[PDB]
Amino acid sequence: SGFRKMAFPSGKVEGCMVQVTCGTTTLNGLWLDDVVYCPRHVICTSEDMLNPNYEDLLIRKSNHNFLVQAGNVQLRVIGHSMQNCVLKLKVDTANPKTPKYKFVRIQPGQTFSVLACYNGSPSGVYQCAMRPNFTIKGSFLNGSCGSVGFNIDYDCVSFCYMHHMELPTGVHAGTDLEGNFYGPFVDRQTAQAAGTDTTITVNVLAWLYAAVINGDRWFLNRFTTTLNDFNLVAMKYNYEPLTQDHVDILGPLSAQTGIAVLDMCASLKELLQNGMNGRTILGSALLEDEFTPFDVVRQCSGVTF
Amino acid sequence: SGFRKMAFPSGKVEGCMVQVTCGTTTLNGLWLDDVVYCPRHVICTSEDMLNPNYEDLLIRKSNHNFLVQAGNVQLRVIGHSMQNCVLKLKVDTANPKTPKYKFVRIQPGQTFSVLACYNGSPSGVYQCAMRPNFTIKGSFLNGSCGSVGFNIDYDCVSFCYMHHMELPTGVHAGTDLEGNFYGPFVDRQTAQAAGTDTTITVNVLAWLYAAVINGDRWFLNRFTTTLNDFNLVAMKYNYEPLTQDHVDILGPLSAQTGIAVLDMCASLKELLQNGMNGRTILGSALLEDEFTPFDVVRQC
Ligand SMILES: O=C(Nc1cncc2ccccc12)[C@@H]1CCOc2c(Cl)cc(Cl)cc21
Numbered sequence: 001s002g003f004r005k006m007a008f009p010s011g012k013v014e015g016c017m018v019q020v021t022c023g024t025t026t027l028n029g030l031w032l033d034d035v036v037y038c039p040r041h042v043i044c045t046s047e048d049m050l051n052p053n054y055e056d057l058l059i060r061k062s063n064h065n066f067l068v069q070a071g072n073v074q075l076r077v078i079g080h081s082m083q084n085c086v087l088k089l090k091v092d093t094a095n096p097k098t099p100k101y102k103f104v105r106i107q108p109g110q111t112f113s114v115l116a117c118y119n120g121s122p123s124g125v126y127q128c129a130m131r132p133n134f135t136i137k138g139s140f141l142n143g144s145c146g147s148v149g150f151n152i153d154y155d156c157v158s159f160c161y162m163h164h165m166e167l168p169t170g171v172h173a174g175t176d177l178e179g180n181f182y183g184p185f186v187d188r189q190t191a192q193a194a195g196t197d198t199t200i201t202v203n204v205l206a207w208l209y210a211a212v213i214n215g216d217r218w219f220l221n222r223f224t225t226t227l228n229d230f231n232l233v234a235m236k237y238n239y240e241p242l243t244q245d246h247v248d249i250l251g252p253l254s255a256q257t258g259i260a261v262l263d264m265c266a267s268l269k270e271l272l273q274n275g276m277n278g279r280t281i282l283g284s285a286l287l288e289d290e291f292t293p294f295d296v297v298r299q300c301s302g303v304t305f
Numbered sequence: 306s307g308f309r310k311m312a313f314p315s316g317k318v319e320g321c322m323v324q325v326t327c328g329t330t331t332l333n334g335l336w337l338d339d340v341v342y343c344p345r346h347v348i349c350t351s352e353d354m355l356n357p358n359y360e361d362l363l364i365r366k367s368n369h370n371f372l373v374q375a376g377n378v379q380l381r382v383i384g385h386s387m388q389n390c391v392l393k394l395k396v397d398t399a400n401p402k403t404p405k406y407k408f409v410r411i412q413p414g415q416t417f418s419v420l421a422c423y424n425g426s427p428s429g430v431y432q433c434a435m436r437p438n439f440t441i442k443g444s445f446l447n448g449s450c451g452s453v454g455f456n457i458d459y460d461c462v463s464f465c466y467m468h469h470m471e472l473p474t475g476v477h478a479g480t481d482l483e484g485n486f487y488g489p490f491v492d493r494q495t496a497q498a499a500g501t502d503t504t505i506t507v508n509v510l511a512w513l514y515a516a517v518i519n520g521d522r523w524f525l526n527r528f529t530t531t532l533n534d535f536n537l538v539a540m541k542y543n544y545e546p547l548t549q550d551h552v553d554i555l556g557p558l559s560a561q562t563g564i565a566v567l568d569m570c571a572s573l574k575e576l577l578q579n580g581m582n583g584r585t586i587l588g589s590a591l592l593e594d595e596f597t598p599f600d601v602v603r604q605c
């Protein structure tokens with residue numbers, strides 16, 4: 001019993017975190033094989049950040065300008081190149097702790113673990129979701145850029161996020177490991193704002209299934225709904241549309257609990273229209289949307305890594 | 306900016322997780338140097354659960370009865386001893402991944418990260434607090450026994466909890482790494498119940514300071530209170546009493562935000578009286594009590 005926000009074990013990722021210093025800027029790098037990946041803004045100063053020509057800035061750099069430190073050992077940079085918003089620093093040593101890994105780009109609603117780092121040292125691990133507005137509501141202070149988001153599949157780490165910046169509202173923006181930003185953001189000091197966020201409906205339904213699995217069942221009702229009628233109500237309350245794909249992914253949880261997806265949707269519809277009435281679900285007075293259906297199945301079945 | 310429930314990076318603990326099998330029971334063990342620590346109930350059968358005599362059961366065991374597996378390698382047990390409710394299995398190999406570590410007994414209100422494991426394999430990591438009733442509200446399934454709670458300060462892992470069991474309400478009970486249970490619990494199937502849980506008041510105040518640091522000010526008010534008046538109100542909402550120690554520990558946060566402890570205390574009394582009125586604090590509609598003052602200063 002129990003349901004917690006649970007991150008993947010971070011060990012395989014901790015063995016890849018290094019410190020990248022370029023001039024006055026120190027941030028984190030991800031050392032995989034003989035390459036160190038980090039945000040390309042490490043090569044910027046004050047003027048550069050306002051209107052940066054990164055290709056021009058990187059051409060003026062040499063390998064010895066990049067100071068890479070793995071633990072207490074200095075790695076020597078033997079090459080540098082840029083792929084979108086990420087800088088790739090070729091080093092003379094392959095990381096002996098390189099795990100089985102992939103670079104994947106995730107979609108909004110998907111969750112991942114963040115290994116927050118400062119000066120190449122992991123300080124914390126937390127679970128979060130890629131919001132529908134492509135920001136993440138993380139916890140990051142100055143020096144955390146280069147911290148990575150990941151999932152673990154069998155014995156394979158899928159790196160899906162690298163932290164780049166904090167938006168004016170306190171939410172965070174970053175890129176996949178190929179340097180492509182999630183969302184309409186840019187790595188430059190300019191006026192940038194996250195779009196109005198919406199609730200991840202499929203994850204709320206998965207979390208209601210996790211609550212039923214844990215014995216919390218007051219919100220269940222006799223009713224069902226059509227997918228279209230539910231989606232009309234979802235739009236009204238800034239909830240993402242629920243697709244047939246989402247209904248199919250919730251199938252195993254529906255079979256396990258005996259509550260059809262559209263039956264759970266009628267529960268959710270009433271929760272939205274009437275509130276919790278002083279009650280809580282899994283110790284929360286709000287509907288939680290940062291647990292995907294796979295997260296609920298993984299946790300409520302004990303899948304290990 | 307941002308405030309999240311954050312666990313410590315679990316790598317230093319993952320390298321210590323092993324599988325301990327004794328007869329039909331398989332649970333987790335913590336391999337540090339040449340010793341594997343695990344719950345002593347791994348030596349229990351069906352009729353040795355309501356009233357087991359662990360000293361008598363352990364005397365009947367030999368080293369060859371304990372099957373320890375670290376990854377795909379079988380460790381050879383060369384000695385066994387019991388320290389309170391923990392079993393210590395001396396092995397013929399020191400764990401090369403043994404980090405700098407300490408065994409620490411924590412107090413209620415203190416937080417720690419849990420590395421949930423099954424069959425000696427880490428499946429997830431989450432942040433917990435030792436409840437005032439000495440239980441933890443974890444997320445554990447059958448086979449999670451031996452999973453450990455820890456904190457990391459600098460390079461050193463302080464092991465503070467080993468999971469032993471789930472109570473009838475779904476909450477969890479366990480021991481420190483010297484086998485001493487937290488709370489009035491025993492490692493047997495006898496009738497046991499967690500006492501009525503209360504809210505960790507000092508942790509709620511620390512979390513309100515984290516909210517002010519993050520730009521949330523709506524719950525602030527022009528009032529202050531005496532410590533005694535705050536406790537008389539707080540206790541009526543099943544909140545732990547706030548001691549002078551707690552007021553002192555909140556001093557740095559009070560200095561940083563400019564809001565005196567007793568001023569924050571009056572804001573908390575108001576929050577208890579009115580509820581949140583549709584508003585949230587740090588993305589939560591309830592008062593969060595699993596962030597200590599130390600966690601807030603660290604994360605902010
Ligand atoms: O956002 C940035 N760093 C941070 C990242 N995460 C949490 C922070 C909390 C507090 C302060 C900084 C934080 C840097 C420095 C500010 O200016 C920029 C600009 Cl203009 C662009 C880019 Cl891509 C990065 C950055």
Ligand SMILES: O=C(Nc1cncc2ccccc12)[C@@H]1CCOc2c(Cl)cc(Cl)cc21
Nearest residue numbers: 001346445446447449469470471492493494
């Ligand atoms: O609770 C126990 N294991 C578990 C631990 N954590 C979460 C669980 C969730 C679901 C099922 C089992 C779980 C064991 C087996 C059952 O009975 C006992 C008794 Cl009577 C005493 C002791 Cl010390 C341990 C245990």
